[PDB]
Ligand binder design. Sequence first.
Ligand SMILES: O=C(O)CCC(=O)C1=CC=C[C@@H](O)[C@@H]1C(=O)O
Length: 252
Amino acid sequence: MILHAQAKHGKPGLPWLVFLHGFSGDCHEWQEVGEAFADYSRLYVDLPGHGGSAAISVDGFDDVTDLLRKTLVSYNILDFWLVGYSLGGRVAMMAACQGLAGLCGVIVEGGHPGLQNAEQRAERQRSDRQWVQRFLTEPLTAVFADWYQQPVFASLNDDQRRELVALRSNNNGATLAAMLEATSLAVQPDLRANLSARTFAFYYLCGERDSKFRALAAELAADCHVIPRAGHNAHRENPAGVIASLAQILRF
Ligand SMILES: O=C(O)CCC(=O)C1=CC=C[C@@H](O)[C@@H]1C(=O)O
């Protein structure tokens, strides 16, 4: 078993760009940005519980990393960057730190490096448990209307929220719930020390208007690219700015 993905072949010999969406996303998330890198090969992955990988269940990050490894092998990917947004950024950091053969660098957009005490982990465990129950029992248009009013999405306007609710409501609430619990920030290690000692290149992207993750990026041993006029999902709101940042990172 491998993850569902969409592959696009670029110039032979250039690295693959392996894109990981965020929670409730799917393999289309990064395509507006990724297809700008037409000379690279692109792998747009559906994480467990998401898109065409809905039926793939995992118990935690070890299982996700293993699935990612198998997927890369299946596509004959030998030399690649991992590019992850939010949950996908956390998956990317976990997989990179656990070890992926052929990884040359990681680019994380708004991915949390980990909580730092038991109180915070308990709070997140409880909060994620409440969302899990909502995803199991409520109309997804109602759940996502509240999802996109969380603080990390405060910066959005009403039009943006309406569009996102409509988009994300194409999803399986049960498999979203299973994945939300399995890869909850509550169960993630604090990766700051590991990221500091990294063998792989590590870059951070953050929307200008994403106050939480601008502060987090400052705690990290990475070059941080602040994306103008963008919130947490900076590549969605300012794709041209994210393409420019990715070009600076990749082509140097
Ligand atoms: O874009 C979205 O709707 C969600 C982005 C996303 O992956 C996350 C948002 C907020 C909390 C988490 O569940 C998750 C994350 O881990 O970043």
